[PDB]
Amino acid sequence: SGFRKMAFPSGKVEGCMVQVTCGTTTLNGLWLDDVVYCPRHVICTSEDMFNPNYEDLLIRKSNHNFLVQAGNVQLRVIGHSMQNCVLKLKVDTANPKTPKYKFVRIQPGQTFSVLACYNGSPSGVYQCAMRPNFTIKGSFLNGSCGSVGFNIDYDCVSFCYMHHMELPTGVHVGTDLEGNFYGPFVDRQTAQAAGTDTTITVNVLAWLYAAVINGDRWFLNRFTTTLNDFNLVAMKYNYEPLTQDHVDILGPLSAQTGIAVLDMCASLKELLQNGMNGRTILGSALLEDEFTPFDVVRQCS
Amino acid sequence: SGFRKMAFPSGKVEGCMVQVTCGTTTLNGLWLDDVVYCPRHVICTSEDMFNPNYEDLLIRKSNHNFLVQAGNVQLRVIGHSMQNCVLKLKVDTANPKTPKYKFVRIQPGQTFSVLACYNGSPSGVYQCAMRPNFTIKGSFLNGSCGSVGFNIDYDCVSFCYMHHMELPTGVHVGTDLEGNFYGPFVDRQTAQAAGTDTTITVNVLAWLYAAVINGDRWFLNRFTTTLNDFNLVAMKYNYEPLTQDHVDILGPLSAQTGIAVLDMCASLKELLQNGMNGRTILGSALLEDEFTPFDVVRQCS
Numbered sequence: 085s086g087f088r089k090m091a092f093p094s095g096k097v098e099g100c101m102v103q104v105t106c107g108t109t110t111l112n113g114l115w116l117d118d119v120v121y122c123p124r125h126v127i128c129t130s131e132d133m134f135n136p137n138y139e140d141l142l143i144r145k146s147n148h149n150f151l152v153q154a155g156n157v158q159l160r161v162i163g164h165s166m167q168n169c170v171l172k173l174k175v176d177t178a179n180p181k182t183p184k185y186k187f188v189r190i191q192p193g194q195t196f197s198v199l200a201c202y203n204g205s206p207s208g209v210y211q212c213a214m215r216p217n218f219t220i221k222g223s224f225l226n227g228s229c230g231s232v233g234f235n236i237d238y239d240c241v242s243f244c245y246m247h248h249m250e251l252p253t254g255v256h257v258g259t260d261l262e263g264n265f266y267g268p269f270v271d272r273q274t275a276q277a278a279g280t281d282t283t284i285t286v287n288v289l290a291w292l293y294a295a296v297i298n299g300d301r302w303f304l305n306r307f308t309t310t311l312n313d314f315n316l317v318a319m320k321y322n323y324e325p326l327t328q329d330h331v332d333i334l335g336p337l338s339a340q341t342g343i344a345v346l347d348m349c350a351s352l353k354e355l356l357q358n359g360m361n362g363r364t365i366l367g368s369a370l371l372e373d374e375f376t377p378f379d380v381v382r383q384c385s
Numbered sequence: 386s387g388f389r390k391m392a393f394p395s396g397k398v399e400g401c402m403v404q405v406t407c408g409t410t411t412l413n414g415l416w417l418d419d420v421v422y423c424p425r426h427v428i429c430t431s432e433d434m435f436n437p438n439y440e441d442l443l444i445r446k447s448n449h450n451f452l453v454q455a456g457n458v459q460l461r462v463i464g465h466s467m468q469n470c471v472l473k474l475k476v477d478t479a480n481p482k483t484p485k486y487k488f489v490r491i492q493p494g495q496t497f498s499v500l501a502c503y504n505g506s507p508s509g510v511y512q513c514a515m516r517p518n519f520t521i522k523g524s525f526l527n528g529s530c531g532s533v534g535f536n537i538d539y540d541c542v543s544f545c546y547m548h549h550m551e552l553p554t555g556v557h558v559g560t561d562l563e564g565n566f567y568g569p570f571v572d573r574q575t576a577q578a579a580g581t582d583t584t585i586t587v588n589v590l591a592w593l594y595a596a597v598i599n600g601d602r603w604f605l606n607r608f609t610t611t612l613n614d615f616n617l618v619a620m621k622y623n624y625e626p627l628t629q630d631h632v633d634i635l636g637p638l639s640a641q642t643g644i645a646v647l648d649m650c651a652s653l654k655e656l657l658q659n660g661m662n663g664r665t666i667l668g669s670a671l672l673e674d675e676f677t678p679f680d681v682v683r684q685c686s
């Protein structure tokens with residue numbers, strides 16, 4: 085028993101992390117097969133970041149200007165191209181540690197593991213969720229650019245995130261592995277706001293199911309509600325509206341615990357309108373929304 | 386910026402995890418050099434767990450009764466011995482993935498990463514702290530026995546924990562890699578209580594420094610206190626007493642932020658006596674005590 089914010093084992097990804105140096109800038113890249121992926125702003129100088137012309141900047145670089153180092157092994161760059169906000173460096177050697185992998189674009193509300201890296205060397209691993217506003221609340225310092233987020237299914241690594249920037253607000257934004265940003269953001273040092281964020285309702289409900297499974301049940305009450313009635317309360321407290329697709333996804337946890345989804349919604353409604361009154365749930369004094377229904381079943385299975 | 390509960394990259398340990406089967410019982414073992422370490426209760430049956438005679442039980446087993454499988458590779462067992470509550474299986478092959486490593490016994494209040502495993506296959510990684518009462522609040526299901534906790538310093542893996550049991554209360558207890566339990570616990574299914582637990586004061590203070598570093602400063606006030614005065618409040622709220630050794634360990638964070646340790650104690654005192662009044666600190670509505678001063682500097686560096 086017990087419930088923790090749990091990351092995937094990072095070994096398969098550690099073997100793909102390399103250091104990419106261009107000019108004076110150094111950050112992390114991802115070496116899969118004979119391609120190295122990294123943020124395209126590796127080609128920028130300090131004065132370039134305000135409105136860089138990445139086409140013009142990339143034109144001034146040659147293969148030999150991109151220094152790729154895998155641990156202590158230097159890689160020979162035989163080609164370079166730009167795809168959206170990602171730079172793709174063709175090297176003459178396939179990564180012998182290349183796991184089975186796919187590139188995927190996750191949806192808001194879904195979770196993944198982040199392997200924080202610096203100078204191509206792994207530093208730590210943690211789980212986080214793609215916020216509804218396409219930001220993530222991570223832990224990133226200068227030099228962390230190029231770190232990636234991922235999920236693992238048995239032996240297949242699904243890469244979903246590459247880190248690019250921290251906004252003035254302290255939140256973190258990035259791209260999928262085809263270089264398309266999550267959210268409205270652009271890789272320029274100019275004003276850009278993240279949308280209003282909201283709480284991931286289906287994840288909060290899944291987390292309440294995980295609490296019940298692990299012995300925390302003081303929040304279960306004698307009430308029930310309707311999808312429409314609960315959504316009235318959701319809107320008031322800036323929660324994502326609950327849909328039937330959400331109810332369906334919660335079906336397994338509902339069956340495992342014998343608590344109807346709408347009954348659990350009545351508990352959440354009561355918590356939103358009255359607080360926890362100094363109590364805690366799974367060691368937290370607030371409602372957690374960074375566990376997906378799949379995460380709960382994984383951990384609780 | 387940002388602050389997260391961050392685990393070490395688990396790759397170096399994933400390559401050491403194996404499956405150990407004895408009779409009908411299967412759990413995880415740690416393969417380092419030509420030795421496999423696992424909990425000695427792998428030799429028990431259901432009826433044995435109430436008062437097993439491990440010497441008598443081990444006498445009925447032979448080398449060929451211990452099935453060690455590293456992924457798909459079967460290992461040939463050439464020797465077996467018992468050290469405290471740990472079983473040591475000598476195999477005829479050295480683990481080619483053996484990292485640099487040491488065995489260490491951590492102190493209460495210190496943290497480490499747990500690689501949760503099942504059937505010798507890594508499942509997830511998370512950070513937790515050795516509670517003052519020598520328990521840990523983890524996430525462990527049946528079959529997780531033999532999972533290990535560790536820290537990593539550059540390239541050296543310090544193993545500090547092997548998982549053995551979940552108590553009726555839901556907390557988790559285990560041994561160091563020499564088979565000595567943390568705490569008063571014994572590997573028998575008999576009544577055994579964990580001592581009164583307390584909050585790790587020095588970790589709470591380090592966490593408040595991490596908050597200030599990352600922009601959360603609403604809890605800083607115009608007061609100060611003394612070591613003796615604060616300890617009066619610590620005792621009231623079941624906090625570990627603060628010592629000068631603790632103040633010394635907080636010296637770096639004090640210097641980095643310019644906040645005297647005793648000034649920060651005055652903030653903690655105010656939080657203990659008045660609560661957070663609905664506010665939050667680093668995304669938490671309670672005082673976090675599972676970050677060590679070293680963890681804060683690591684992440685914030």
Ligand SMILES: Cn1cc(-c2cc(-c3cc(Cl)c(F)c(OCc4ccccc4Cl)c3)c(=O)n(-c3cccnc3)c2)c(=O)[nH]c1=O
Nearest residue numbers: 109110111125224225226227228229249250271272273274
């Ligand atoms: C040379 N150099 C630079 C970086 C590096 C670059 C960036 C970075 C990259 C680009 Cl294109 C930007 F438009 C940018 O302005 C963000 C911004 C500022 C002000 C107003 C609005 C906005 Cl949007 C920032 C970064 O944000 N970080 C970072 C730091 C801390 C946590 N996370 C990310 C790091 C690096 O890692 N390695 C390396 O060598």
Ligand SMILES: Cn1cc(-c2cc(-c3cc(Cl)c(F)c(OCc4ccccc4Cl)c3)c(=O)n(-c3cccnc3)c2)c(=O)[nH]c1=O
Nearest residue numbers: 410411412426525526527528529530550551572573574575
């Ligand atoms: C056959 N078998 C058994 C286990 C296995 C054994 C145990 C386990 C081992 C020993 Cl020696 C015990 F005295 C024991 O009684 C704990 C207890 C019960 C009642 C009152 C007081 C006490 Cl103290 C339990 C276990 O606790 N867990 C576990 C489960 C969930 C989370 N964490 C740990 C698992 C295994 O993993 N694999 C495998 O094959």
